[PDB]
Amino acid sequence: PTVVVMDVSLSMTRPVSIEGSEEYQRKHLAAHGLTMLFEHMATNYKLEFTALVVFSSLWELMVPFTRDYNTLQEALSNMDDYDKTCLESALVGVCNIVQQEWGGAIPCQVVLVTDGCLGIGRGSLRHSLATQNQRSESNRFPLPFPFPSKLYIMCMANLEELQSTDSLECLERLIDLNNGEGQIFTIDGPLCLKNVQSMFGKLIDLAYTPFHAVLKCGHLTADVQVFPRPEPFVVDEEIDPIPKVINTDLEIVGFIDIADISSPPVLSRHLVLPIALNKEGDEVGTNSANQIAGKIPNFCVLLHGSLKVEGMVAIVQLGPEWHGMLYSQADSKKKSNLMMSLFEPGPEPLPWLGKMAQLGPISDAKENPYGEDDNKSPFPLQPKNKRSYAQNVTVWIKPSGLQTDVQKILRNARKLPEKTQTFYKELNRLRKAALAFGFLDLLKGVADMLERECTLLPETAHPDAAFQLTHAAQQLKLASTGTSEYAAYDQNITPLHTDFSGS
Amino acid sequence: FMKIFSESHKTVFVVDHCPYMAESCRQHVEFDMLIIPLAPISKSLWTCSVESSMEYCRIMYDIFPFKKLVNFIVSDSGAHVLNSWTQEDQNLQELMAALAAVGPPNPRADPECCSILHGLVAAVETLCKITEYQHEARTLLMNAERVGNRGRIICITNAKSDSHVRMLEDCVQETIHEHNKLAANSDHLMQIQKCELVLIHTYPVGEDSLVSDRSKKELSPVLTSEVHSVRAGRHLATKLNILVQQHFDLASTTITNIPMYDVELLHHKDAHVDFLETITLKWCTPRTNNIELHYCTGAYRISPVDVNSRPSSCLTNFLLNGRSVLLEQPSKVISHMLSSHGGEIFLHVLSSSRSILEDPPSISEGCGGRVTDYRITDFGEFMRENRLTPFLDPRYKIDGSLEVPLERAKDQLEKHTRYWPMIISQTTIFNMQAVVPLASVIVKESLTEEDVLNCQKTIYNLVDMERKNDPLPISPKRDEQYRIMWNELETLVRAHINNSEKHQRVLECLMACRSKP
């Protein structure tokens, strides 16, 4: 998204040229520049959300985030004039309106339009930059922006004017406080409409050029737009320092059911929309143009329609060892169109899928891994070693943890010889854990409890129960000594082979 | 520096096995619940420190199955390294067997030359040994091995006094200094650029601690030391539970409203970066059919603090069975999701804010949006037939440079789309059920003998249809229909004649049977 921060202070009413070369005031060339920007967005960057903030002594959100660039254009008409500037307070508001709408992970571009005349005093920028260190968290400086940001400063004053009053140094200081993310735009010449249009034209080429690509699935192709333009990605500055840009040819390499991809973590999501091109790569002269393109079968429509009906995603090759997925809007009561998510670069972004390079066609398989009735799936891949929650582990730190193990042993002790196998598995489970932790006194205590259970066996009990309880209780005491008997970790307690079953 | 090779890459536990470690922590354990109840029993200091350190390694191994290695050392009359740096030796089951083999400390044993110093020296020496991940990074750079080598030594013992503790620190400092000189002149060792020493003094409950706490102190440009005084038992386990969160940047999440108490999970702190000490998330009632594909900005492995408690067991077993859980922050806001992936439970970070991709352009108003006869059904079958499947062992069909499965999947998509009209009105043969036996196999790399017969039988049937003058779905004259139909079938077959010589014979069969060109 974009937040336009427009200066409406009194200094913006100064003439653009005291020589009378043009009649505009600073605020009029600012409106002309923003008009050029909004008109470009309305035709070549339609989906961008843009808000308009005006600031003087106070700041006001004049237009909240919108794609209606007519209402943004109409906001530049007959703008009121005010007084001093208070740039820091408006930049606080920029932080608020951005996080309040998009959170803190969505890249936003802040376009500050001012003449650099920010004055001296309380709300001045020269004072705010001097008192940057103090106040700590209660009144912290808005820069750097908590969200990924670019701070573009469109100066409605030429380079000679900005340098003559140290105003340029303050504007350059703002970008340095934003980690160099941004750019100052100045005119080293006469302030005029021609040079301001050239200035905003450079902002357009830098920050609002749509990303074109070609979506391919074998011989099925479509010229597409990827919105928003993907941010160049740097993995590890020490190991892999080159910023990664997705391949212009978006090659589909296979398909995976939505249930198998699960909900993978992705870097970003982007809409993939077809564009009408011609011989020179021009986008159809940026209603008759869209009607002609509307009746030409496009692979995006076929792909998106099939992906939604089939509930599937299309794996895309973004580059060497970089992949992503194309899919349809999964909420079925919202509007749906084709979009793309980028995985973390690397050969194994998702463990449950394995190495992307080892994903092949089912034709090369011996049997169809999804089943003849499409009732199975080779996914998810399982990790070679189980985790502690998917496996039996012994934890006796809390007293309730130990009482649970002895109660499971006691319950199965009262159900013999029916539960003989699980009784001896829970018994050896506690035996091994006691030998590992060196908690041999527990073995004596459990053996005493098994002896008590044997004596308290009801007269209506199976005869084998008394034999196995005393056998387990005696073999557990012999393990509590430490002298090599059943004190060895590998030697399990086996039940007595009593002949009570039918001979 | 090195990113993965920070302090947490190498962790070395040093627990003393000396006779005095058999002393009772004097914290009674009630194992018998309800006759005359049995007398409660107490664990030893050695048992308390082995419990707390193994629980430390349980939480780490769940959250970091790779690249976070541990060396477990016990110290008595000598040092005993129970496992190496290899990822294969990062196994709790094998550690328990090794701990059982060394057994408990003998109270009536010779306490001479029995000292924690043995394992402390062994901790310094193993920190200089190369791990598998470090060895692979060395082979890569050949930036010529700027590979960082850092570590952390967690030492649990029962010290005499602060003077005794400072002596342990000075011994570690002098040992790191001297052994780094030996490691520098060795082809298969690495110097210790940074080391954090954590000395944990534990003692039975009811006593007064003979060792006092001391914050982090810089003893050397390499070594930072820090001591802790904590009662054995529950207090000692609570200390290592806090230390595992600091050493690996772990955050805590408490799940409430679990229908069946509350469950606390540990994970990397990045799972709460998007949101903003514990984060409370409410269990959302799982709708029978919710959204299948969630936009996820991050998935982080978890580990339950109370892995065996009934509330946490019910939660984890619910996830392991296959169902997911949506989490809500106290309309409403669903911010996270718990989901198991082949037995491994991840904490998914979801998007709660407004989507910049909301209200997309209409399909109907974009390119090709006014076309009504897209072969959505047929292309849906295309996607099912070109689904990916994992291959584990390297495979081939000839011999030479090995064959990559994903390249073969990409190649199959090329052959399958050499002739694939996107709309119904642009094709005739793909609207005829009689063409299916030929069209489905003619795109194959090589034809089986039964494939050839079915291709010929398809062509023979089309001659029968042309003789009976059956109507065709061409989207005009009957003679003109089959001419167009034969031309289209010829186009499809010629798109694959270079696949094999059998493909060429299928074309010879087509050219001889079709209406005279």
Author numbering:
A (entry chain B): 2 to 287, 297 to 513
B (entry chain A): 0 to 33, 41 to 148, 150 to 267, 279 to 294, 312 to 365, 370 to 514, 523 to 564
How does the study describe this entry?
For several indispensable short non-coding RNA transcripts in metazoans, this initial 3′-end processing step is carried out by the Integrator complex (INT). Here, we show that human INTS13, INTS14, and INTS10 form a stable functional entity and characterize this new INT module biochemically, structurally, and functionally. Furthermore, the INTS10–INTS13–INTS14 subcomplex directly binds the cleavage module, consisting of INTS4–INTS9–INTS11.
To elucidate the molecular basis of their interaction and gain insight into their potential function, we crystallized the INTS13–INTS14 complex and solved its structure to 2.5 Å resolution using a combination of multiple isomorphous replacement (MIR) and native single-wavelength anomalous diffraction (sulfur-SAD). At the center of the complex, the two homologous β-barrel domains form a major contact around a rotational pseudo-symmetry axis. Another large and complex interface is generated by the interdomain linkers of INTS13 and INTS14, which fold onto the surface of the respective opposite β-barrels and also contact the VWA domains. A particularly remarkable and unusual feature of the interface is formed by the linker region of INTS14, which threads through a loop between the first two α-helices (α8, α9) of the α-helical domain of INTS13, thereby generating a physical interlock of the two protein chains. In addition, ~140 residues from the mainly unstructured INTS13 C-terminus are missing from the structure (residues 565–706).
